[PDB]
Amino acid sequence: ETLNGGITDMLTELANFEKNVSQAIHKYNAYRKAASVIAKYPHKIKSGAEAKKLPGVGTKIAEKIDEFLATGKLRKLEKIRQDDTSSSINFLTRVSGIGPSAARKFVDEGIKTLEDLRKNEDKLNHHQRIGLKYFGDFEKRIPREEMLQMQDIVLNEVKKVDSEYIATVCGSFRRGAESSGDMDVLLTHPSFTSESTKQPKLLHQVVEQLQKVHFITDTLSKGETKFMGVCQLPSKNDEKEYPHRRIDIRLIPKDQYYCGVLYFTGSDIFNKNMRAHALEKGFTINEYTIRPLGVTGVAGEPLPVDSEKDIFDYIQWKYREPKDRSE
DNA sequence: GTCGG
DNA sequence: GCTGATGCGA
DNA sequence: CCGACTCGCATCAGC
Ligand SMILES: Nc1ncnc2c1ncn2[C@H]1C[C@H](O)[C@@H](COP(=O)(O)CP(=O)(O)OP(=O)(O)O)O1
Ligand SMILES: [Mg+2]
Ligand SMILES: [Mg+2]
Ligand SMILES: [Mn+2]
Ligand SMILES: [Mn+2]
Ligand SMILES: [Mn+2]
Ligand code: NA
Ligand code: NA
Ligand code: NA
């Protein structure tokens, strides 16, 4: 549906193969960087040489593009799709909690299908049992309309705990996406700063409240600053119950909000791009701060930030609306 | 797999 | 039973 | 040529 969708689809499938089967994370990132830069290219690619002009597209990817443009397919991908071990590992990783290591371990023991997981559920940990339970739901997209209803529940229940919590839905939702893969929530409270003593139960109070009104249905991981779990909109009068959804909550110091919003909003590739430019400009950006870089390349103190645009200003970038960060 | 060095 | 090692999602 | 490309949380192997 995009200018170079056939090429970027091929590159994404090759990326997932290198992550799930080969366990070569830098190849996975290399394919993703190539797909992202091609996705931003304003012309329809006619040759591998044309794509090779783009940063991140090298000899082999340009060669794969020429084959795909000539034959409409890739022999390398067709061999992968046919390899029983490769496609089995590739499938098992679609279960949340089953990564490349567990997928390879299961497949070696003849555990390679969904029904194999159900039959061998005793060998799954709690996370994997949940990922298997909601396997279909977790692959459904969340229409933005439903994200607004979820945002209403989250922000309202959070206010019910304490008036001074601030909850901001980030991720693809804040980037204006018509559909989202999950709900990502950033949480702050005046009592938690970078200079304050650990106030526990700050995130626990919010998670407990969302559980009490039956919004959060299951927990995958839960600590003092990060919650990973499952949520579900309420359904009306025995009508079609909603699909269960993944939700992430991150509690960050209030004085590092805007660096947190910038990171949590994404995209992941955009963050990689922005942080790469920051180093070319004498700064280093992470999830919490932007710091200067000295003559020796050492990181200074966190710089003052009171807006997302403040971070763009430091590295001398034109401000990008969250809508234009989906890279 | 790519690119800078 | 505890500690270090490792996998997981992001 | 070749080396570069973060963390909180859950679990469990190895004592
Ligand atoms: N591999 C990674 N490691 C660390 N941080 C990462 C990350 N990938 C993404 N992020 C950051 C930026 C995302 O906006 C934000 C959410 O990451 P995410 O997994 O929720 C993907 P998102 O951009 O929200 O779209 P969608 O598929 O859910 O509709 O977290
Ligand atoms: Mg042009
Ligand atoms: Mg249910
Ligand atoms: Mn079977
Ligand atoms: Mn998300
Ligand atoms: Mn998320
Ligand atoms: Na690699
Ligand atoms: Na190139
Ligand atoms: Na998985």
Side-chain angles (χ1 to χ4, degrees), chain A residues 2-197 199-235 237 241-294 297-315 317 319-327:
Chain A
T2 70
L3 266 199
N4 297 288
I7 295 173
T8 57
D9 276 356
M10 166 186 73
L11 291 180
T12 291
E13 196 182 336
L14 282 164
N16 294 332
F17 167 82
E18 300 290 349
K19 178 189 184 314
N20 299 329
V21 180
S22 310
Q23 279 189 260
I25 194 60
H26 304 298
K27 290 196 178 185
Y28 165 81
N29 287 332
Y31 278 123
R32 271 158 89 255
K33 167 184 187 165
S36 168
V37 68
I38 279 157
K40 288 166 57 165
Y41 187 57
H43 310 275
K44 162 157 283 272
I45 295 184
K46 312 299 178 42
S47 89
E50 181 184 359
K52 175 104 161 49
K53 285 147 62 81
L54 302 173
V57 182
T59 302
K60 308 268 285 268
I61 292 179
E63 166 173 315
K64 287 179 173 67
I65 282 169
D66 277 332
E67 161 172 358
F68 178 76
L69 290 172
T71 73
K73 66 184 202 187
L74 197 71
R75 285 163 299 141
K76 180 161 157 87
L77 263 182
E78 282 280 82
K79 296 189 246 230
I80 283 162
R81 288 164 163 168
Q82 282 159 20
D83 184 67
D84 193 66
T85 284
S86 309
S87 46
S88 272
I89 281 167
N90 258 336
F91 172 71
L92 285 187
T93 67
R94 293 165 58 185
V95 176
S96 192
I98 293 176
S101 154
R104 175 171 303 285
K105 174 221 133 180
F106 285 138
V107 164
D108 275 4
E109 301 161 12
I111 300 176
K112 73 223 293 207
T113 69
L114 209 77
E115 294 217 315
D116 291 346
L117 292 180
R118 312 196 169 287
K119 179 208 178 194
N120 291 269
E121 178 154 22
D122 41 298
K123 312 184 169 61
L124 307 192
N125 62 34
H126 172 78
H127 185 149
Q128 293 161 334
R129 280 178 208 212
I130 301 282
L132 177 65
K133 176 169 168 190
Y134 304 121
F135 180 81
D137 284 357
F138 282 178
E139 298 204 325
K140 291 168 174 297
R141 319 264 321 162
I142 315 173
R144 191 177 181 84
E145 194 284 301
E146 281 174 48
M147 291 290 284
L148 299 169
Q149 303 181 238
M150 296 152 78
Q151 182 186 49
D152 260 305
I153 297 201
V154 164
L155 269 46
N156 181 66
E157 293 308 318
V158 155
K159 185 175 123 202
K160 287 201 224 154
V161 181
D162 182 71
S163 98
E164 296 306 295
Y165 278 118
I166 291 183
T168 310
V169 183
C170 302
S172 54
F173 173 85
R174 195 163 176 271
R175 303 201 303 275
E178 283 325 302
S179 74
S180 288
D182 68 351
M183 164 154 283
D184 305 299
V185 180
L186 203 59
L187 188 63
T188 69
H189 186 275
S191 68
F192 177 37
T193 70
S194 56
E195 302 173 10
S196 84
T197 320
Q199 292 269 340
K201 284 172 130 123
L202 253 201
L203 178 58
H204 173 85
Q205 281 169 62
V206 165
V207 169
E208 266 213 345
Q209 182 65 33
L210 295 171
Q211 290 170 318
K212 204 71 212 203
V213 297
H214 308 114
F215 181 66
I216 282 176
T217 65
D218 305 89
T219 298
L220 301 175
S221 57
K222 184 186 174 297
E224 292 193 346
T225 53
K226 281 187 188 158
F227 176 82
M228 178 175 314
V230 187
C231 66
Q232 177 182 233
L233 285 175
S235 163
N237 295 108
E241 95 174 22
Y242 279 98
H244 297 239
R245 315 291 205 180
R246 280 270 297 103
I247 180 152
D248 297 329
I249 310 167
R250 181 190 269 252
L251 175 67
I252 60 157
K254 195 179 168 99
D255 59 326
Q256 307 177 336
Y257 171 79
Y258 288 105
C259 269
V261 182
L262 173 75
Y263 150 77
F264 216 30
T265 293
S267 83
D268 190 49
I269 269 56
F270 170 83
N271 288 343
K272 288 186 192 276
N273 288 331
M274 181 158 180
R275 297 171 187 200
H277 180 70
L279 301 165
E280 296 178 340
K281 288 297 200 172
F283 304 89
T284 170
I285 298 171
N286 70 350
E287 304 167 5
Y288 296 107
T289 55
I290 175 171
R291 297 165 185 261
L293 291 178
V298 201
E301 291 326 280
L303 302 173
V305 173
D306 293 283
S307 69
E308 290 200 290
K309 201 182 178 296
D310 276 351
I311 309 167
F312 287 85
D313 285 347
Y314 280 124
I315 68 180
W317 257 15
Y319 176 77
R320 309 254 295 264
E321 229 56 59
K323 292 139 188 15
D324 307 313
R325 303 177 200 163
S326 294
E327 304 191 338

